[PDB]
């Protein structure tokens, strides 16, 4: 009977770094997507495998809300079948994804003069992530032929890279807050339904 906690996801003061992307499980609640539909300020709102207009009338077993910050020209990677640093090493959606991706410019919240060094992405990895895999490890990356033995130095790099968001950057380089809603269509009873 309780409303789903979308406000805690969308309106959180800080979001996660994309390598350490945050997942809220949305369960046993009424999901009111009206405040999402009413906003004119989302730069991206795109669904996959679902009609995007009927969310207030649909029932799902569970909904997962994943959220993080990336830069604007990387939002294209938050979709099935993409490649690049984010899709390969940070947040991977499966090829037959069912859900919606919402994003908005967050330059006013996540940039600062001199640089915001709190938002990170994984720059180096030995293999691509599997869909919905999360890698928060900080093992030293061997870029050369000689092993690192856990020590940074020449040819041995910390795997995470700071975005350094600054508000005077071009829009493609500004931070964007992303929420990915994954819709679960199992055969168990529905526990997340819209108001109608």
């Amino acid at each position, epitope marked *: 009977t309780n409303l789903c906690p979308f406000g805690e996801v969308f309106n959180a003061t800080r979001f996660a770094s994309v390598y350490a992307w945050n997942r809220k499980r949305i369960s046993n609640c009424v999901a009111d*997507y*009206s405040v999402l*539909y009413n906003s004119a300020s989302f730069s991206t*709102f*795109k*669904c*996959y*495998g*679902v*009609s*995007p*207009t*009927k*969310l*207030n*009338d*649909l*029932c799902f077993t569970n909904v997962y809300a994943d959220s993080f910050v990336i830069r604007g020209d990387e939002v294209r990677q938050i*979709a*099935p*079948g993409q490649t690049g640093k984010i899709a390969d090493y940070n947040y991977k959606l499966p*090829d*037959d994804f069912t859900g919606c991706v919402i994003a908005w410019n967050s330059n006013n919240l996540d940039s600062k003069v001199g640089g915001n060094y709190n938002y990170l992405y994984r720059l180096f990895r030995k293999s691509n992530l599997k869909p919905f895999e999360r890698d928060i490890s900080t093992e030293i990356y061997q870029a050369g032929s000689t092993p690192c033995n856990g020590v940074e130095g020449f040819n041995c790099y910390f795997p995470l890279q700071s975005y350094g968001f600054q508000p005077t950057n071009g829009v493609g380089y500004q931070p964007y807050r992303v929420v990915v809603l994954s*819709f679960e*269509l199992l055969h168990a009873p529905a526990t997340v339904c819209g108001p109608k």
Partner: single-chain antibody
Amino acid sequence: EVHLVESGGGVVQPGRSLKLSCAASGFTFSSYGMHWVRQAPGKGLEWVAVISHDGSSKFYADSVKGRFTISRDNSKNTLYLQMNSLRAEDTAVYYCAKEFYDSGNYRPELFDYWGQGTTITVSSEIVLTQSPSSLSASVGDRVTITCRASQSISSYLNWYQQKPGKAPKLLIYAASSLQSGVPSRFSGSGSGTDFTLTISSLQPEDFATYYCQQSYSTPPWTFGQGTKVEIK
């Protein structure tokens, strides 16, 4: 018995405003989402806007965002498109289209029935590619039309027939399901990025332009560029 009648078109200068209307009958109007789709002279189909059955959800093509407003009055069974700040590349025939599934169905949506359109002249995403662009064949022949998607669209690929001068007609939905009233010679196959429409024995009334369109990732709903079929 579904009927859709657009009106409100005309010739206007750039920067002017124009309201289109679509009067619906023959179905329960308040149970269905509705779309506007347009077609510039000599060009293909371009999705414009969508509104949910109660008006609470609305999406727009990027080219019209901030200038067009989609609206509905379910008590009058009428759909509207308020077009402001009009401009030369808004010139097109505008069609209203009824959605295919009911309001509680999760499935990717598509264009069940279309009105005949109203014309506007303004005075002085997943990409689908079809092959071939045009072909000539004889009555009785097999015709094969391919549609490739830039990105996997699973099964959500639909086919429309557009006779010259007419509103488009849904032929196939969900890659291979036949729309009611469509003759058995039309069939569709494929999945992922690779789809085929086949007409097994071409008939005289089959000369038309055939369009694929994907419903997997929306908005925007997107269309192939069209395949023109002629009867020699």
